[PDB]
Swiss-Prot record, chain A:
Mg(2+) binds at D114. The gene is PDE4D. Zn(2+) 1 binds at H77, H113, D114, D231. The chain holds residues 390 to 712 of 809 of the full protein. Long isoforms that share a conserved PKA phosphorylation site in the N-terminus are activated by PKA through phosphorylation. Isoform 3 and isoform 7 are activated by phosphorylation (in vitro), but not isoform 6. 3',5'-cyclic AMP binds at H73, Q282, F285. This is 3',5'-cyclic-AMP phosphodiesterase 4D. Belongs to the cyclic nucleotide phosphodiesterase family. PDE4 subfamily. Zn(2+) 2 binds at D114. Expressed in colonic epithelial cells (at protein level). Widespread; most abundant in skeletal muscle. It is linked to Genetic variations in PDE4D might be associated with susceptibility to stroke. PubMed:17006457 states that association with stroke has to be considered with caution. Acrodysostosis 2, with or without hormone resistance: A pleiotropic disorder characterized by skeletal, endocrine, and neurological abnormalities. Skeletal features include brachycephaly, midface hypoplasia with a small upturned nose, brachydactyly, and lumbar spinal stenosis. Endocrine abnormalities include hypothyroidism and hypogonadism in males and irregular menses in females. Developmental disability is a common finding but is variable in severity and can be associated with significant behavioral problems.
């Protein structure tokens, strides 16, 4: 079983990794084994003098703080977003663009970006007067919480994977991670996409053909959109993965809708199991959210993402054909 | 003693209220007695159907969560910002609904609650629990909001129990928008927007919520930075208090080997030069813009600010 797991982890650089199989083969430790594999692939333990036992202890603790009883926003989603960000970071149009610290920030942000997610939306937490929404003044409630947990767990015994970074490196990494995870708030999607469109329309490339990013605002904006694309990448994956992600998010959404209905609240979009069209919802999700984002990402890195975009468009056509 | 306190509160509508005397005469309850007076002066208990006992219970609880061992950011500052906002809201030239007035006054009352007497940058650079919770972003102001709202859930403390569901949602949003705007790192952006509004000012007039909340943000920020515009005897007491708080923070930064924050190094301080710099660079640019917005209602306030700057300069 460990032999089979190792073989599957050889696909870590590939879009369409069998992430559900890795979750089973690893004993429900996909985030740990995929993060460890990616850290070895990018030589990050050596570069940042991360002790391997510290990395594993932190990863196992972080993975524990994802909820195993939440169908979608769990450790498998986290591992998937990590691995997708890892592939997006390797795209030819970004070669040598980001520093090792920025690469570390983007992967770490992906790993923590949904930790301790309760399986209900920001708006649900706000409208139910939740302790989380009270703590965070109704503002990026979940995302502030994911950050606070992800950073707090570094203080647990033998968990500070950043123990050998300089103070300035720790300070910079912390700021970048915060900027990245806060941008995964779905209420920010339209503004993030608008700014990404502006960057594509005005983009510049070096003599070597890679994206020219010469200030923090532009660099962090690319990393924000990269992780947001990774978070919204399920419809760009091979259909058998996409359908499993859709089954999971619909379970989570329907359970939220059941709580909304019981409370006499308006039921959130896609959360009403008695008035649901999952197929129509997917076509609309792709048409209005996912394809506008991924088409713009594909333009930024053209032609690197053409196959991802082709898969997204095929999946849209497939779902449309079931209507 | 309880008879002198009543006469002091008769000037609740005046710039330069004797808030330190009121703090003393009320047994260190200036926030509770001044908020009550202002709510009674504005028949807010009747307009929003607030039980008097519920108001007093909340107010005492809120006042209790200001720290008595913090020389500046305590319940006297809270009472003073409340009362200053109350006066600025009565500016003839101002147009806000009664829910907007309520949000501005409530926001003023809670805007520094549970302040530990150190700055956001201090909390960030020391890896505090507060900065860990709030991801280094408006750390104090997010905390003040969360405490102020949480206290409404204590027994007999929900002063908004008789607002409609929509009113509570609207009030909550405005209070958050206002208190977050009191973060001093946002001063330049806030002032830039106040200037833009002044250049486009229409009067008989703020038609969109964006403009109105910006005025309320700048109004409470003005009230928060109103000490140098008060009568000199008041301003000097506020200066003595914040210098004590700053110097205690700078002692902690020195001991930790951190860079000492501006005005916090007691061994290289010039309180007087700091006051002229504070007025020239922060307070007077802000108040000159506010006075342009409300022309000419703020003339006496700006006059006092300019007199106080002249006096501090003469002490150098
Ligand atoms: C308001 C609105 C229309 C949507 C905003 C919104 C959220 O706030 C949160 C999560 C999603 C989402 C995420 O991952 C999916 C994966 C699938 O495989 C299928 C899916 O449908 C989805 C989703 O919907 C979402 O779309
Ligand atoms: C420079 C800047 C943009 C912000 C720095 C900054 C803070 O962060 C926080 C509080 C103050 C401040 C407040 O109330 C005062 C009252 C006085 O009577 C005398 C005073 O000196 C001050 C102050 O200094 C401040 O200036
Ligand atoms: Mg999320
Ligand atoms: Mg404050
Ligand atoms: Zn996510
Ligand atoms: Zn204040």
């Amino acid at each position: 079983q460990e032999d089979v797991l190792a073989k599957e982890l050889e696909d870590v650089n590939k879009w369409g990794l069998h992430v559900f199989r890795i979750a089973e083969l690893s004993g429900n430790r996909p985030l740990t084994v995929i993060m460890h594999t990616i850290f070895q692939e990018r030589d990050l333990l050596k570069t940042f003098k991360i002790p391997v036992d510290t990395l594993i202890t932190y990863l196992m603790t972080l993975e524990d703080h994802y909820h195993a009883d939440v169908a979608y926003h769990n450790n498998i989603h986290a591992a998937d977003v990590v691995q997708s960000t890892h592939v997006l970071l390797s795209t030819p149009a970004l070669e040598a663009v980001f520093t090792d610290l920025e690469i570390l920030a983007a992967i770490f942000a992906s790993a923590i970006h949904d930790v301790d997610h309760p399986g209900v939306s920001n708006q649900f937490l706000i409208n139910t007067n939740s302790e989380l929404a009270l703590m965070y003044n109704d503002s990026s409630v979940l995302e502030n919480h994911h950050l606070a947990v992800g950073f707090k767990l570094l203080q647990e015994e033998n968990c500070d994977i950043f123990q050998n970074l300089t103070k300035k490196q720790r300070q910079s990494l912390r700021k970048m991670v915060i900027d990245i995870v806060l941008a995964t708030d779905m209420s920010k999607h339209m503004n993030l996409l608008a700014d990404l469109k502006t960057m594509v329309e005005t983009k510049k490339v070096t003599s070597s053909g890679v994206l020219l990013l010469d200030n923090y605002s532009d660099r962090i904006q690319v990393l924000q959109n990269m992780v947001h694309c990774a978070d919204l990448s399920n419809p760009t994956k091979p259909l058998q993965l996409y359908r499993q992600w859709t089954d999971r998010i619909m379970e989570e959404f329907f359970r939220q809708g059941d709580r909304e209905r019981e409370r006499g609240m308006e039921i959130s979009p896609m959360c009403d199991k008695h008035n649901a069209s999952v197929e129509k919802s997917q076509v609309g999700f792709i048409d209005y959210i996912v394809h506008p984002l991924w088409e713009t990402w594909a333009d930024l890195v053209h032609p690197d993402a053409q196959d991802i975009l082709d898969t997204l468009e095929d999946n849209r056509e497939w779902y449309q054909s079931t209507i």
